[PDB]
């Protein structure tokens, strides 16, 4: 069966609070007035007496609009997965009593996940038996969620319980939405606007192309005599929707809640209200060409990578100097790519004290100072902001504002040698305390007490060097660890190392939003053999429209055709009178996609040509005029204007 969702399927895209604004976002919503897969979950009893029920493998393309009208315990679970053969992580959201067991585990439970109700009112009892799942493998993530993910039910004569759940397939979070709203009538369709707030956001990532609902079996006693034909009235009926990428215009209220929404697409009235930004649309043409829907994909990034900064020889070289002569290497006039660092070796302490490692490529930096030095094995953390160590106070010291990282790894394979290991030193004896980023390459004899030590050193005097014996038999704690600190300075200047801009694989023959080397727009990308000059990057036609651009990647020529379909217009007689509208595709012979009438300017879809002549209410074009009259139950008509 199928139904029609009038104005249902709207939720809060982001968590930012908004008030008295009309924002339009591009996300995956449910289009208004769609065909939701209506499935009445009731008992089916055949002539022979075998109990059966419908449970198809419904596909989870990009999201669903699963609603439910269960009374007590009919629908208390869901199942997600793309393989269902112990190959991908599943999702069993067990909506048990007073709690919800969200289990993300990869295993093959079964093919028909049946489960009874077992309405045991005991406080210490388990209703989810072991009949749903049968395997037990390693689970990646799980949760408790003490607040049960289930709305409250009401008990009244005609006031029933209504609830819906909006799910998506975002790799970041599952984006679970929930909202409860009581109905007022028992025989009327649930026509109304109800937004859904984000309940929980599971940070799990797994491919999910199909899903399965978890209904209630409840076949303890069929009670023959009353349910011989299965069921008569109906226990519950779950809806199954499908989200589609649309540009929905949301209108926030004063308190910060969505009271209505505009589709801005697939609907003439919504497209009119979107292109005019006014609810009460006047009598005009209001061209909205090349702006109707156009949702295909999302490919936006900066191509043409260039010479990588000399990050090598600082993470992998022949021999690094000690803290005595710690080498410095500034990096400028390049774009940093913090992706080859991890490929070197499994690190030991990736603690960036100034920024997040996943945010290094989101802001520009003036000049990164790469300082590498070999230290002992029990001092990997002594070199940190605000630490008083014997190798961190009389040697290379970090300040209280080190906005870099302390990237370090183990070098018990390259720097290790079965010998005396007189290659490194640490200079424990120092006169004063080294300031941040202070390098002392002096070899003067230290003198604590009153003892003249110009020539040589004795007992009171010491030498500013000591052999760093790294025996291969020594375990962790006395092994050579190579540490490199990338000092990220913050100076407002012509910075060079911003980020590793890497575009996608140049998708073509598809109407997607293109943003290549600054220029941003939309349209289709087709093949073209234009021979552009080697220094020309942008192209323009005679009408100042971007027709072709040079690929910043390897040598290839593209052709950005808008697909403007002539000029899409739409006529609206005013929302105060009615809501019926019509579209006029100017420049179309009614072949490039309801009453259809071809005019001299375009194809008018949504009105009929009347042979009569009245006063021109809405100017269509080329003598054509439309109006909203009570034809004998009112609709937009088309006619020729009367000159007298």
């Amino acid at each position, epitope marked *: 069966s199928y139904t029609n969702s009038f104005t249902r399927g709207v939720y809060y895209p982001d968590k930012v609070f908004r008030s008295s604004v009309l924002h339009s976002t591009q996300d995956l919503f449910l289009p208004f007035f769609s065909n939701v897969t209506w499935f009445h979950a009731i008992h089916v009893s055949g002539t022979n007496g075998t109990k059966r029920f419908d449970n198809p493998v419904l596909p989870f393309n990009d999201g669903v609009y699963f609603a439910s009208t269960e009374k007590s315990n009919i629908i208390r679970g869901w199942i997600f997965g793309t393989t269902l053969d112990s190959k991908t992580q599943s999702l069993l959201i067990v909506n048990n009593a007073t709690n919800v067991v969200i289990k993300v585990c990869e295993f093959q439970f079964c093919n028909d996940p049946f489960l009874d109700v077992y309405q045991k009112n005991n406080k210490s009892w388990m209703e989810s038996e072991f009949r749903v799942y049968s395997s037990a493998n390693n689970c990646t993530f799980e949760y408790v969620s003490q607040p049960f993910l289930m709305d409250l039910e009401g008990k009244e004569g005609n006031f029933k319980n209504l609830r819906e759940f909006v799910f998506k397939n975002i790799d970041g979070y599952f984006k679970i939405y929930s909202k409860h709203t009581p109905i007022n009538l028992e025989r009327d369709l649930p026509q109304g606007f109800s937004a859904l707030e984000p309940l929980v956001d599971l940070p799990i990532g797994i491919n999910i192309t199909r899903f399965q609902t978890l209904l209630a079996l409840h076949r303890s006693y069929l009670t023959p005599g009353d349910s011989s034909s299965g069921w008569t009235a109906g226990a519950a009926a779950y809806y199954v929707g499908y989200l589609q990428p649309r540009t929905f215009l949301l209108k926030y209220n004063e308190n910060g809640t969505i009271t209505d929404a505009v589709d801005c697409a697939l609907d003439p009235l919504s497209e009119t209200k979107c292109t005019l930004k006014s609810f009460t649309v006047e009598k005009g043409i209001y061209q909205t060409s090349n702006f109707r829907v156009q949702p295909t994909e999302s490919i936006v990034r900066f191509p043409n990578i260039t010479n990588l900064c000399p990050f090598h020889e600082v993470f992998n070289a022949t021999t690094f100097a000690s803290v005595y002569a710690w080498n410095r290497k500034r990096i400028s006039n390049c774009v940093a790519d913090y992706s080859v660092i991890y490929n070197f070796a499994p690190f030991f302490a990736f603690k960036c004290y100034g920024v997040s490692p996943t945010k290094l490529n989101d802001l520009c930096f003036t000049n990164v100072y790469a300082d590498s030095f070999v230290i002992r094995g029990n001092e990997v953390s002594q070199i940190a902001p605000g630490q008083t160590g014997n190798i961190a106070d009389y040697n290379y010291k970090l300040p209280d504002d080190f906005t870099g990282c302390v990237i370090a790894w183990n070098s018990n394979k390259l720097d290790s040698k079965p010998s005396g290991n007189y290659n490194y030193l640490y200079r424990l004896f120092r006169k004063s305390k080294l300031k941040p980023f202070e390098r002392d390459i002096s070899t003067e004899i230290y003198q604590a007490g009153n003892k003249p030590c110009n020539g040589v050193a004795g007992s009171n005097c010491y030498s500013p060097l000591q052999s760093y014996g790294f025996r291969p038999t020594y375990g962790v704690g006395h092994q050579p660890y190579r540490v490199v600190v990338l000092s990220f300075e*913050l100076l407002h200047a012509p910075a060079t190392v911003c980020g590793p801009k890497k575009s996608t694989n140049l998708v073509k023959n598809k109407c997607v939003n293109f943003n290549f080397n600054g220029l941003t727009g939309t349209g289709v990308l087709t093949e073209s053999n234009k021979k552009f000059l080697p220094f020309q990057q942008f192209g323009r036609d005679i009408a100042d429209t971007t027709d072709a651009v040079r690929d910043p990647q390897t040598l290839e020529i593209l052709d950005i055709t808008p697909c403007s379909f002539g000029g899409v217009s739409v006529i609206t007689p005013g929302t105060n009178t009615s809501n019926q509208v019509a579209v006029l595709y100017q420049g179309v012979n009614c072949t490039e996609v309801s009453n259809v009438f071809q005019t001299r300017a375009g194809c008018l879809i949504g009105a009929e040509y009347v042979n009569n002549s009245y006063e021109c209410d809405i100017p269509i074009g080329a003598g054509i005029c439309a109006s909203y009259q009570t034809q004998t139950s009112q609709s937009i008509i088309a006619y020729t204007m009367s000159l007298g």
Partner: antibody
Amino acid sequence: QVQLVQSGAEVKKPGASVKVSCKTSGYTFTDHYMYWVRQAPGQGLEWMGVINPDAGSVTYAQKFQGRVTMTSDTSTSTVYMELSSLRSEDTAVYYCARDLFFIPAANSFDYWGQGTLVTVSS
Amino acid sequence: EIVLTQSPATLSLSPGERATLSCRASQSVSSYLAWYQQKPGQAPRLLIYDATNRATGIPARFSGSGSGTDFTLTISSLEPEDFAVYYCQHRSNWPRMFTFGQGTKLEIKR
């Protein structure tokens, strides 16, 4: 001994540019940052601003924000400061100050110059 | 930016006693503050940096302290070469916007 020598006196006109240099000495001008501070007659220190000895890594103030260009030079180890469009309120004594920390960090000013009385009149 | 304001702005004392000049702020600058000393006719010298430790070439009479949003300098014994104008400056980490105050003059009581 580290002694930062600066210029002497300098008179100008409304809507012009003054070039004031502050040569370094004693220390290796590759590791210590340098700042430029203004001292108005009767008032106190007003603006910050750092010039990198190695590269053109600078950071101008918020009051000026575009009307000052602080260049660098490793040949003679001397900094420069060219304030553009001098008004009747920019007459002050400009100083050059170093830092106790090295290239990455900056805590405060330790070594100061001698000042330069730049004025704007006829 | 952080409006460094000094309340007294005129601390008339006598040579030999102790002085306490305050320079408060708004944001947490517990470890981000500097102390200067500008005598009339020369360049300002660094008095106390990092707001907790002593600078180089500074006599032992200059001792600073403070944390949070309230700082003060504790001079041991005033000397004739100590009467000058003192300032305060914090070190903002990400936005380099080093700001100063107004200055407190140290007079001689007679």
